[PDB]
Amino acid sequence: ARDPKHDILFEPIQIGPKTLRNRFYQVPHCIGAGSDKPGFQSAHRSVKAEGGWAALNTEYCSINPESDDTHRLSARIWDEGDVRNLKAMTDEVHKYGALAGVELWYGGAHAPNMESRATPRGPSQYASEFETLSYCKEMDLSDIAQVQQFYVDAAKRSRDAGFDIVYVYGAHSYLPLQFLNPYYNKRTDKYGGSLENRARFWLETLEKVKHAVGSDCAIATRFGVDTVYGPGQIEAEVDGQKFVEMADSLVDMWDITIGDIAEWGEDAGPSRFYQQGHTIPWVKLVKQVSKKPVLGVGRYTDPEKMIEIVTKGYADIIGCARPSIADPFLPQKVEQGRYDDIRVCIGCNVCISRWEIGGPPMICTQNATAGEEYRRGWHPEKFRQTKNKDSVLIVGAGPSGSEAARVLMESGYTVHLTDTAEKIGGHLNQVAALPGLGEWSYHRDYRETQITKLLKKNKESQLALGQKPMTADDVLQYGADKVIIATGARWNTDGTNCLTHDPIPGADASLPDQLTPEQVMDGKKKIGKRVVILNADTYFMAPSLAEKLATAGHEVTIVSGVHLANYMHFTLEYPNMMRRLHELHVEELGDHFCSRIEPGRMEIYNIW
Amino acid sequence: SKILVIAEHRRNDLRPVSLELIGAANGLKKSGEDKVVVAVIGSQADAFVPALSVNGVDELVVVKGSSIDFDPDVFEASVSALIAAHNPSVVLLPHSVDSLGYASSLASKTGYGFATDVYIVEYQGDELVATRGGYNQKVNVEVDFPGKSTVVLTIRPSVFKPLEGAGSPVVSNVDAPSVQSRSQNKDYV
Amino acid sequence: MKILVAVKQTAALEEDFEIRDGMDVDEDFMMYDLNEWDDFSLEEAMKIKESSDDVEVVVVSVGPDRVDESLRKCLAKGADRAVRVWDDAAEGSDAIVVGRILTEVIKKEAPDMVFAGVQSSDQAYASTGISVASYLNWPHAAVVADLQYKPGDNKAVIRRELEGGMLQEVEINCPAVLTIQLGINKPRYASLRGIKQAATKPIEEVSLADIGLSANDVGAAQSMSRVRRMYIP
Ligand SMILES: *c1c(C)c(C)cc2c1nc1c(=O)[nH]c(=O)nc-1n2C[C@H](O)[C@H](O)[C@H](O)COP(=O)(O)O
Ligand SMILES: Nc1ncnc2c1ncn2[C@@H]1O[C@H](COP(=O)(O)OP(=O)(O)O)[C@@H](O)[C@H]1O
Ligand SMILES: Nc1ncnc2c1ncn2[C@@H]1O[C@H](COP(=O)(O)O)[C@@H](O)[C@H]1O
Ligand code: SF4
């Protein structure tokens, strides 16, 4: 049963005119649905409402076409069409007793407007440091009044759409933050200069929105209380706290983040760099001055960490984005004391990577039903039950084979899962041993735990590890009705690569001076002093091996025929990864690949 | 009447659990007048008299046998002989690998009270009550031993605290039954 | 040549089980399966069988009808024959009473070697095997982590796993009773076809009268301790 100390997480809390039923709150987050895939939006949020979350928010929700994020996908509330589409989500969230919230967004020059082609407006004219070809027009006084009116009209549409909670969004350096922050705001009139003047845009917006919908909706605000950039942007104990004091009477609930837009992996901290609770030192500064309920995200998945921040008085509410994606049912599982059923977010940011690429639906490393609830009918916690006594053999217990076993066992099937490996997890066991990636092990820990419990209740199923490798004869004679082959992949040993699709002459990882990732991670093969990594992969392997090797004292050079760590731009890991490689003295040679290798030397070429 | 502790040693050294058992025995007496006898068994067990001449020990019987260290046939024969000669109310063995080798054999023959891996012992008036685990340690199980004049317990190590300081026990030596054991200890690895 | 492996079907409890009377946990919260140490016992017998020519491996268990499920698993995992001993009067038989029961079926079977697990996962008496040795009057060793034995020899060499990981070699007369420790080998897993074939096999049922015992020899009434109370600490 639930630990009595977690009872606090299930106490209601008032926010203006509305009541949260418990302290579990899904802050606004992208999913790749917006107002364009109303099925996906309504299923994704409503499964979490069924799962016990007290409030579910849309992602950033454009108030007008001159804040259009195309090629990235935002929600929109521009007209009656959008009101109909989003109301599917509010109706569905209400069916499970949760509040529904919308996040009113205007991006200034950060929105590249590739669909609308309209001109964004801003406190001063700048080219966005994130969208570097996108510029805004400087706002005159009427412009300011016009954009304020956009917020008002969107907030009235939001009430029509059935939302309970309406945000003025001033985090990730969007428009209210731009007026606040002298990095953007160069004005010398009464909206620039002193704090009072810099806050005036966001304060008037809040007053107008509260005036229009406040009797009916909680007015929340999301605030990047510190840009984590040092002086020169917003700092929590300089402008941050003082702004909270100025706005406190207008806000029903504070939702606090850190960081800017170009580097918002400081907010959505990758486990590679940040532990659960990494934001606390900045976030707790808000309750030092606010009299209103406060939340601030921090990759919260553990109820022990959750009651800590509430009992100490650092936050009232547990805000979550990623934990709610990994486990829509995290709150119900805490409520029922089913702690070992919690599917814990690994902080890989693959979910975000989809959004960042611009256009595709979200996917999730832990939760293979994220994005699939509506379009495939896949509920994360409900499984169609088999009507036969079919048995399935599964060769390999890596992420795919172990997922297949888990789902088949939850579906009532007899399964026999087998692997040569000592533990569940396949290639993820070495991957999670790379520098910074220890939390990626939760993906296999969850499956190891679940499989062990499913065997206790599915009595004809079996797990066999440390086995002799299955042969074709072993499979054919095994006695299963269906067989799944999940035997994995390996890194190439002969130089085969995406540029030429052929081996490289002289490449051979059986030679004493050449190694694959697996040989490096195994740790047995000796490595010399001067290391060259030859890279044709754009995700984490080459950078992570470079980190591991330079930290162990090697002199490392990366020769990359593809854009090094390109995919880490999308996971938001790229900036701290580059800082890490720089401070470790890893040398990079971009735009080169290799035509032949020999003992102790290789021939490289410029790709252009 | 008497409480019998069977001490334990290996490769020349007394195993500290021996002191914990003296601890337990002393905490269990139903009167200052009850006496704790400790026995140490081995061909060279006279060497342990110094380490066993400690607070709580009223009699130290050294029993010499065939084996230097633990052997199941020797120990069973030796302990049955100690029990018959000292008629103790309670005999305390460590719950140790050595004791697994013979403890339950002592009980099978005899109809003595027997419980293993005991972590609470107590008298409730005149009935001995022992607590051990159940269902993979998820419960405590309290047991008693009706009409049993001799109860044999094995005791979980690192639970009972040893007495402090030295003692002045009457030492005796005896010989094991010279019967040849059906096993032979060879080397340690 | 015959190796007889005594096996036990152990109880595991669901969260959050309840004490029923105060004399036990409520049955509804109990799941039964093959004692973990018995996989290693059984494997060692199968190693011996597979290392030579002709060795009958028989498994034997004292308990009610539900035990059939665990003896079947043994058949699937290599055992040649399975025997179940029972009478309702044996409920509440302690480790020493079960040792007596096992002794009388072992005599009926007349094996060359007896293997027991070091302890059961549920009650962890660490007593039943060695109680069997005492009633059989057979040489015995407890906590065996290595076994050198060839069928028909007089004479086996074991290693005892002591506190702190250290091992002691012991030469032991046969026939002997050995209690087998975790880690001695790598127990095998039967395949679905193995299990299906095990399903066709008989479980031989043996009563107390069959082994010269009666209601008066068994049960809680004949045991060396008496449960006063179970509680969650
Ligand atoms: C998109 C994606 C998928 C991620 C996970 C976060 C995110 C996304 N879009 C957001 C947006 O539409 N508006 C906004 O205010 N915040 C958005 N987020 C950031 C998210 O809300 C959280 O601030 C971070 O993910 C950190 O919280 P947590 O994941 O550690 O709980
Ligand atoms: N013939 C085989 N028999 C049993 N297991 C195998 C065999 N070949 C490969 N495997 C196992 O398959 C697993 C594949 O896992 P992994 O590489 O993580 O693949 P995936 O990412 O698709 O789940 C490894 O744990 C490996 O040991
Ligand atoms: N009811 C039983 N039937 C057959 N063997 C048993 C039974 N109970 C215990 N054993 C044996 O004793 C072993 C160790 O358990 P124990 O002394 O009961 O903790 C088991 O692995 C079996 O070999
Ligand atoms: S993709 Fe990774 S960071 Fe995102 S919710 Fe899933 S497990 Fe967490």
CA of A494 to the centre of ligand 2 (A): 21
Gap between the terminal Cα atoms of chain C: 48
CATH value at residue C30: 3.40.50.620
- The answer to whether C35 is annotated as binding is yes
Q: Report the C-alpha gap between A94 and A597 in whole angstroms.
A: 64
Whether residue C189 and residue A467 make contact (CB cut-off 8 A), yes or no, is yes
CA distances from A8 to A5, A11, A16, A327, B181 (A): 7, 5, 20, 20, 65
Q: Report the C-alpha gap between C57 and C77 in whole angstroms.
A: 11
Which CATH architecture best describes the domain A1-384? Alpha-Beta Barrel (3.20)
CA distances from C187 to A234, C36, C156 (A): 63, 10, 21
Q: How many CB atoms lie within 10 A of CB A387?
A: 7
- Residues in chain A closer than 8 A to C16 (CB atoms): 1
Residue A481 CB-half CA count within 13 A: 8
* Helix and strand totals (H; E) in chain C: 5, 12
- Residues in chain B closer than 8 A to C174 (CB atoms): none
Give residue limits of the domains in chain B.
1-189
- What CA dihedral angle connects A579, A584, A590 and A593, to 10 degrees? -140
> Which of A597, A564, A590, A592 shows the shortest CA–CA distance to A578?
A564
Q: Which atom of ligand 2 is nearest to the CA of A471?
A: 1
DSSP state of A437: -
Per DSSP, which regions of C110-215 are E strands?
Answer: 113-117, 140-148, 155-161, 167-173, 177-180, 204-206
A203: exposed, middle or buried (C-beta count within 10 Å: 0-12, 13-18, 19+)?
A: buried
Q: How many CB atoms lie within 10 A of CB A377?
A: 11
DSSP-derived secondary structure for B145-180:
-TT-S-EEEEE-TTSSPPPPSB---EEEEEE-----
Per DSSP, which regions of A453-536 are E strands?
Answer: 462-464, 482-485, 530-535
Whether residue B104 and residue C134 make contact (CB cut-off 8 A), yes or no, is yes
Give residue limits of the domains in chain A.
1-384, 385-491, 492-608
Report helix, strand or coil for B189: coil
The answer for A37, left when phi > 0, alpha when psi is -120 to 50, beta otherwise, is beta
Structure tokens at A461: 């199923």
Indicate the CATH number of A492-608 among 3.40.1030.10, 3.50.40.10, 3.50.50.60, 3.40.50.300.
3.50.50.60
Min Cα distance A461 → chain C (Å) is: 10
Q: Report the C-alpha gap between A574 and A156 in whole angstroms.
A: 40
Structure tokens at C88: 């309702």
Q: Report the C-alpha gap between A602 and C204 in whole angstroms.
A: 72
Q: Report the C-alpha gap between C123 and B132 in whole angstroms.
A: 9
Q: Specify whether the CB–CB gap between A86 and A364 falls below 8 A.
A: no
Please tell me whether the peptide bond between C64 and the residue prior to it is cis, using omega within 30 degrees of 0.
Answer: no
Annotated catalytic residue, options A174, A300, A314, A446: A174
Sign of the torsion angle spanned by Cα atoms B83, B85, B88, B94: negative
Ligand nearest to the CA of A393: 2
Containing structural domain, residue C70: 1-233
A333 shares contact with chain C (CB less than 8 Å): no
The resolution in angstroms reads 2.0
Ligand nearest to the CA of A447: 2
Instruction: Give the contacts of B1 (CB within 8 A, at least 6 positions apart).
Output: B34, B35, B87, B88, B89
Q: Specify whether the CB–CB gap between A580 and A554 falls below 8 A.
A: no
Active site residue A539: no
Which superfamily is assigned to A385-491 in CATH? NAD(P)-binding Rossmann-like Domain (3.40.50.720)
DSSP H or E stretch at residue C134: helix C128-136
Distance of CA B91 to the CA centre of its chain: 6
> Which of A259, A207, A203 shows the shortest CA–CA distance to A236?
A259
CA of A321 to the centre of ligand 1 (A): 5
> Which of B50, B70, B68 shows the shortest CA–CA distance to B60?
B50
State the total domains in chain C.
1
Structure tokens at C224: 């060396």
Q: Specify whether the CB–CB gap between B118 and B155 falls below 8 A.
A: yes
Report helix, strand or coil for A262: coil
Q: Report the C-alpha gap between A41 and A75 in whole angstroms.
A: 10
Q: How many CB atoms lie within 10 A of CB A430?
A: 16
DSSP state of B50: H
Whether residue C122 and residue B134 make contact (CB cut-off 8 A), yes or no, is yes
Instruction: Give the contacts of C35 (CB within 8 A, at least 6 positions apart).
Output: C7, C8, C9, C10, C70, C117, C120, C121, C122
Q: Specify whether the CB–CB gap between A584 and A576 falls below 8 A.
A: no
Q: Report the C-alpha gap between A582 and C122 in whole angstroms.
A: 56
User: Which ranges in A77-125 belong to alpha helices (H)?
Assistant: 80-95
- The answer to whether C117 is annotated as binding is yes
Radius of gyration of chain C (CA): 18
C226 shares contact with chain B (CB less than 8 Å): yes
DSSP state of A237: I
> Which of C168, C134, C102 shows the shortest CA–CA distance to B97?
C168
Report helix, strand or coil for B142: strand
Which chains would you list as touching B if contact means 3+ CB atom pairs under 8 Å? C
DSSP-derived secondary structure for B69-134:
S--HHHHHHHHHHHHHHH--SEEEEE-SHHHHTTHHHHHHTTT-EEEEEE-EEEEETTEEEEEEEE
Q: In chain A, after which residues is the C-to-N distance over 2.5 Å, breaking the chain?
A: none
Q: How many CB atoms lie within 10 A of CB A569?
A: 17
Q: How many CB atoms lie within 10 A of CB C16?
A: 9
Indicate the CATH number of B1-189 among 3.40.1180.10, 3.40.1110.10, 3.40.50.620, 2.60.40.680.
3.40.50.620
> Which of C60, C86, C87, C63 shows the shortest CA–CA distance to C74?
C60
Topology agreement, domain A1-384 and domain A492-608: no
DSSP state of B68: S
Whether residue C189 and residue A480 make contact (CB cut-off 8 A), yes or no, is no
- The answer to whether A171 is annotated as binding is yes
Instruction: Give the contacts of B87 (CB within 8 A, at least 6 positions apart).
Output: B1, B2, B149, B150
- Residues in chain A closer than 8 A to C12 (CB atoms): 456
C129: exposed, middle or buried (C-beta count within 10 Å: 0-12, 13-18, 19+)?
A: buried
Q: Specify whether the CB–CB gap between A73 and A181 falls below 8 A.
A: no
> What per-residue string of b and e applies to C83-120 under the rule 16 or more CB within 10 Å gives b?
bbbbbebbebbbbbbbbbbbbbbbeebebbbbbbbbbb
Please tell me whether the peptide bond between A71 and the residue prior to it is cis, using omega within 30 degrees of 0.
Answer: yes
Tokens 């969260």 label which residue?
C15
CA distances from C225 to A46, B114, C97 (A): 58, 6, 11
Instruction: Give the contacts of A602 (CB within 8 A, at least 6 positions apart).
Output: A506, A532, A534, A559, A594, A596
